[PDB]
């Protein structure tokens, strides 16, 4: 009954950021030390919460959200940020309590000639609300003429591939990101630290 953090952090394939994965962690012992004692992460930022104090607390659910972005977008996975990722792909709330964890995945997610399998949303009629997930492929109406699902002048496909080549500069290399969210409901608290 160890919490299955391995299934998120060590997944062979990650989600595109527009279609970010969420894992519900429940009814298990959360060994947070496996994460905070690791040398495997370059980003490990916890807002209004300490992963060492999490060991002493119980939650109804913990959520692990995971996806790939490029290195210079990791800064957008934070409260109060703007840019294509925070605006159109994955939005944290201003009052976020939880952890943002990231690591360079150039060895897994780049290939010679380009890995194009990871996409981002480039166009949207409004910014995402916090933890909103938009997987629509509706043609984006950039002007006054309705598209009727046909691409052309002012009528664009709303997604685009990252081009991940192993020789990309570090700012253009793929990073795997996991966001931990903590939830208390009117229900049993089933996710507890080892204490």
């Amino acid at each position: 009954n160890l919490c299955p953090f391995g299934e998120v952090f060590n997944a062979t394939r990650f989600a595109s950021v527009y279609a970010w994965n969420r894992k519900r962690i429940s009814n298990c012992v959360a060994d947070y030390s496996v994460l905070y004692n690791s040398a495997s992460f370059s980003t490990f930022k916890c807002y209004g919460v300490s992963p060492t104090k999490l060991n002493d607390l119980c939650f109804t659910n913990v959520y692990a959200d995971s996806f790939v972005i490029r290195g210079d977008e990791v800064r957008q996975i934070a409260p109060g940020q703007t840019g294509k990722i925070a605006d159109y792909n994955y939005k944290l709330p201003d009052d976020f309590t939880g952890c943002v964890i990231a690591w360079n995945s150039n060895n897994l997610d780049s290939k010679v000639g380009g890995n194009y399998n990871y996409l981002y949303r480039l166009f949207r009629k409004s910014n995402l609300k916090p933890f909103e997930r938009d997987i629509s492929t509706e043609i984006y109406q950039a002007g006054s003429t309705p598209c009727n699902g046909v691409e052309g002048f002012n009528c664009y496909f709303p997604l685009q591939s990252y081009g991940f080549q192993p020789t990309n500069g570090v700012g253009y290399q793929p990073y795997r990101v996991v966001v931990l969210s903590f939830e208390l409901l009117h229900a049993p608290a089933t996710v507890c630290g080892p204490k």
Partner: nanobody, 127 residues
Framework: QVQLVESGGGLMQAGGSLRLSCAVS????????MGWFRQAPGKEREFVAA????????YYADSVKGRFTISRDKAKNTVYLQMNSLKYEDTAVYYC????????????????????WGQGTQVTVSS
């Protein structure tokens, strides 16, 4: 390995219509677009048409607009080129091409590189 296999080429009288097929096997999920190109002997290969795999919007070279139609059957992993009103000038080897690069602007598929290519099928338009 991803394989592209064209079929349907042959001898046609001018003014007739012919459908080419290109069947794709191996990886499926990753396909962004499929294109048709053609090359006459001693001439440079040229873009004919592209189709976005999701959604199915098509982009055409000016020299085949109103005449050729590109279409695809996702379930059969196959792209088609319906070549109406055949001209002597359409005589060439027709090549299908596949890209996994999702581009927001459909017109990118007229000039961006394709990483997978078929062996080509010969179309000859007589009289």
């Amino acid at each position: 390995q991803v394989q592209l296999v064209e079929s349907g080429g042959g001898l046609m009288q001018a003014g007739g219509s012919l459908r080419l097929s290109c069947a794709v096997s191996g990886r499926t999920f990753s396909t962004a677009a499929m294109g048709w190109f053609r090359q006459a002997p001693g001439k440079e290969r040229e873009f004919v048409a592209a189709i976005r795999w999701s959604g199915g919007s098509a982009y055409y070279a000016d020299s085949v607009k109103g005449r050729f139609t590109i279409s695809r059957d996702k379930a059969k992993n196959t792209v088609y080129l319906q070549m109406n009103s055949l001209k002597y000038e359409d005589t060439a080897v027709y090549y299908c091409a596949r890209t996994e690069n999702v581009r927001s602007l459909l017109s990118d598929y007229a000039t961006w590189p394709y990483d997978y290519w078929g062996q080509g099928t010969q179309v000859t338009v007589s009289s």
